Amino acid sequence: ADYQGKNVVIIGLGLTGLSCVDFFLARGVTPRVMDTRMTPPGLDKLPEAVERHTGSLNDEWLMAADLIVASPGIALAHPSLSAAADAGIEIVGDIELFCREAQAPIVAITGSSTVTTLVGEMAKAAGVNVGVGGNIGLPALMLLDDECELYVLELSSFQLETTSSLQAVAATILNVTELQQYRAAKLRIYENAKVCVVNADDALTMPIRGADERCVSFGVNMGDYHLNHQQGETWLRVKGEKVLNVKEMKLSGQHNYTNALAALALADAAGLPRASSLKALTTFTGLPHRFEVVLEHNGVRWINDSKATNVGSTEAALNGLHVDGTLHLLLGGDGKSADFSPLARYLNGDNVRLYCFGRDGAQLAALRPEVAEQTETMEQAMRLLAPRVQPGDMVLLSPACASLDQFKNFEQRGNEFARLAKELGG
Numbered sequence: 001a002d003y004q005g006k007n008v009v010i011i012g013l014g015l016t017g018l019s020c021v022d023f024f025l026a027r028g029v030t031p032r033v034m035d036t037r038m039t040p041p042g043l044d045k046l047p048e049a050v051e052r053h054t055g056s057l058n059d060e061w062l063m064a065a066d067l068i069v070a071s072p073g074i075a076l077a078h079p080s081l082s083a084a085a086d087a088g089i090e091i092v093g094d095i096e097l098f099c100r101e102a103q104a105p106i107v108a109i110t111g112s113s114t115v116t117t118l119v120g121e122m123a124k125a126a127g128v129n130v131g132v133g134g135n136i137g138l139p140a141l142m143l144l145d146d147e148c149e150l151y152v153l154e155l156s157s158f159q160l161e162t163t164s165s166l167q168a169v170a171a172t173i174l175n176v177t178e179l180q181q182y183r184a185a186k187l188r189i190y191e192n193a194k195v196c197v198v199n200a201d202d203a204l205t206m207p208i209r210g211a212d213e214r215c216v217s218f219g220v221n222m223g224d225y226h227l228n229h230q231q232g233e234t235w236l237r238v239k240g241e242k243v244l245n246v247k248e249m250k251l252s253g254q255h256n257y258t259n260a261l262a263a264l265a266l267a268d269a270a271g272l273p274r275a276s277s278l279k280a281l282t283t284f285t286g287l288p289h290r291f292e293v294v295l296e297h298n299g300v301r302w303i304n305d306s307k308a309t310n311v312g313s314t315e316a317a318l319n320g321l322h323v324d325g326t327l328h329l330l331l332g333g334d335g336k337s338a339d340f341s342p343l344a345r346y347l348n349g350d351n352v353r354l355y356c357f358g359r360d361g362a363q364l365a366a367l368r369p370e371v372a373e374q375t376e377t378m379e380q381a382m383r384l385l386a387p388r389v390q391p392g393d394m395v396l397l398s399p400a401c402a403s404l405d406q407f408k409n410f411e412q413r414g415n416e417f418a419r420l421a422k423e424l425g426g
Contacts, residue, residue: 001100001101003024003027003029003067004027004028004029005029006029006066006067007032007064007065007066007067008024008029008031008032008065008066008067008069009031009032009033009034009061009062009065009067009068009069010031010032010033010034010069010071011034011035011057011062011068011069011070011071011074011081012035012040012070012071012072012073012074013033013035013037013040013041013042013043013046013052014040014041014042014071015041015042015138015139015422015426016071016094016139016141017033017035017040017042017071018042018045018046019094019138019139019140019141019142020069020094020097020141021033021046021047021050022141022142023097023141023144025047025050030049030050030051031050031069032050032051032052032053032058032061032065033046033050033051033052033053034052034053034054034056034057034058034061035052035053035054036054036055036056036057036074037054037055038054038055039054040054057074057078057080059080059083062080062081062083062084062089063083063084063087063089065084065089066089066090067089067090067092068081068084068089068090068091068092069092069093069094069097070091070092070093070162071093071094072093072156072158072159072161072162073158076091076161076162091162092162092163092164093158093159093161093162093163094139094140094141094159095134095140095153095155095159095160095162095163095166096162096163096164096165097141098140098141098143098144098153099163099165099166099167100165101144102144102151104148104149104150104151105149105150105151105168105169105270105271106150106151106152106153106166106167106168106169107119107150107151107152107153107168107169107170107171107266107267107270108153108155108166108168108170108171108172108189108193109152109153109154109155109171109172109174109266110154110155110156110157110160110172110173110174110186110189111172111173111174111175111176111177111186111199111205112174112175112177113136113154114256114259114263114286115172115174115259115262115263115266116132116134116136116152116153116154117132117284117286118259118260118263118280118281118284119132119152119263119266119267119270120132120152120296121280121283121284122263122264122267122272122276122277122280122281123149123150123152123267123270123272124280125276125277125279125280125283126272126273126276126277127276128149128150128272129146129147129148129149129150130148130149130150130151130152130296131143131146131148131150131151131152131296132151132152132153132154132296133151133152133153133154134153134154134155134159135153135154135155135156135159136154137154137295138295138297138422138426140153142297142426145297145298146297146298146299150270155189157182157185157186158185160185160186160188160189161185161188163188166188166189166191166192166193167192167193167194168189168192168193168194169193169194169195169269169270169271170193170194170195170196170197170265170266170269170270171189171190171193171195171196171197172189172196172197172198172199172205172262172265172266173186173187173189173190173198173199173202173204173205174199174205174262175199175202175205176202176204176205183204187207187208190207190211193214194214194269195214195215195216195269196211196214196215196216197215197216197217197218197262197265197266197269198215198216198217198218199217199218199219199262200217200218200219200220200222200223200226201219201220201222201258216265216268216269218258218261218262218264218265219258219261220254220257220258223261224238224239224265225237225238225239225261225262225264225265226261227246227254227257227258227261228242233245233246233247234246234247234257236257236260236261236264236281238261238264238265238268238274243274243278244278244281244282248281248282249281249282249284250282250283250284250285250286251281251284251285251286256286260281263277264277264278264281287307288307288411288414289304289305289306289307289410289411289414290305290307290308291303291305291317291398292304292305292414294417294418294421294422295418295421295422295425295426297425297426298391298425299325299390299391299392299393300389300390300391300392300393300394300395300425301393301394301395302394302395302417302418302421302425303394303395303396303397303398304397304414304417304418304421305317305396305397305398305399306397306399306403306410306411306413306414306417307410307414308398308399308400309333309336309399309400309401309402309403309410310336310338310400310401310402311335311338311339311340311342311343311400313398313400314331314343314398314399314400315342315343315346317396317398318343318346318347318398319346321346321394321396323351323392323393323394324392325351325390325391325392325393325394326351326352326353326388326389326390326392326393326394327351327352327353327393327394327396328353328355328385328388328389328393328394328395328396329347329352329353329354329355329396329398330355330356330357330378330381330382330395330396330397330398330399330417331354331355331356331357331361331364331365331367331398331399331400331401332356332357332358332359332360332361332364332378332381332399332401333357333358333359333360333361333399333400333401333402333403333404333405333406333413334358334359334360334401334402334403334404334405335359335360335363335364335400335401336401336402338400338401340363340364340367340400341367343367343400344367344368347367347368348368352368352371353371353372353373353385353388354367354368354371354372354373355372355373355374355375355381355382355384355385356372356373356374356375356381357374357375357376357377357378357380357381358376358377358378358399358401358405358406359401359405359406360401361374361375361376362374364399364400364401373385377406378397378399378406378413378416378417378420379416379420382395382417382420382421382424383420383424386424386425389425395421395425397413397414397417399413
């Protein structure tokens with residue numbers, strides 16, 4: 001849309017509020033920001049030209065606004081917002097701002113992560129540049145920067161409440177778990193959807209009406225997409241046909257089989273090739289910290305392999321690793337008396353750069369010091385490479401060491417890497 005010369009107020013900062021600020025600053029609009037918290041997150045990232053008010057809502061700013069952009073964290077029933085609404089002031093959310101500008105198909109998912117991640121993996125297996133965001137990953141507005149061909153948004157009922165311009169190529173309510181108002185907000189995801197993917201085992205996921213010929217179902221024993229145990233084997237079944245033995249999947253358990261069925265039905269409805277999507281089901285592990293993609297933005301892939309607390313596990317990550325551009329590898333920690341020389345056969349070539357840290361970091365940078373860097377902690381290493389990273393590059397944390405020298409456990413090192421990937425790469 002055109003927001004030129006409008007008084008815009010953003011309620012709620014954080015990364016989402018920051019994305020709205022950038023969204024408007026890039027369209028010639030300087031917004032005003034307010035947040036009930038005295039020191040909200042992202043306050044230090046907030047530009048200087050932007051007026052901000054913290055510790056409470058500025059009711060005058062709201063009543064004076066032409067457009068109120070409300071984070072899902074503030075209740076729309078709040079008296080100031082209720083008064084703004086009664087005064088005829090337009091209230092929207094960040095997702096509404098996204099859907100007005102999005103030029104690529106949108107897949108929309110709501111219902112009490114894996115489904116959203118799988119759909120993204122299926123699009124990637126088909127060579128589709130996909131932006132995964134919303135209630136997970138990056139905020140939706142930050143996906144407009146890249147050159148996406150498909151959007152996959154995980155949405156809350158709160159985000160849906162303030163969204164009116166969503167026309168998803170495929171939408172789903174996975175579950176409605178603790179009421180009729182809660183369901184009503186979630187059903188908004190179906191409005192103007194080309195295909196509605198519903199849960200055969202949860203009737204509240206079905207539209208009340210107006211979806212007679214655009215519904216596709218997933219379920220355990222029933223639905224267009226369901227499971228079937230026949231000749232002693234369990235099969236994924238799609239539109240009456242066996243398409244995959246669940247033993248080819250890395251994921252396991254009934255819940256992950258229904259997750260795969262739901263993700264498959266969205267990807268099929270969005271036009272992704274079945275063959276490439278089924279392949280994604282055979283490669284996706286969903287293991288935290290084990291070659292876990294934590295951020296895909298601006299053509300860069302940030303991969304958290306903090307689970308590699310030994311030389312053998314890092315060698316596995318490097319072995320057969322195709323990186324279109326530059327691999328930015330981080331190495332360090334407590335090596336635990338390990339010999340890292342076997343890693344050298346994978347660290348030759350032009351596209352390798354090393355960023356070493358931790359207790360045994362000095363010993364790890366000694367694999368090819370000419371193209372290597374050294375630091376004390378993981379954070380300052382990532383701030384060195386973040387300016388240097390360009391599209392096609394991979395930022396891989398396969399440290400080959402345990403994290404007990406500077407971390408509670410390898411999980412903390414992997415979570416900290418994901419936190420800094422969002423800041424540095426977004």
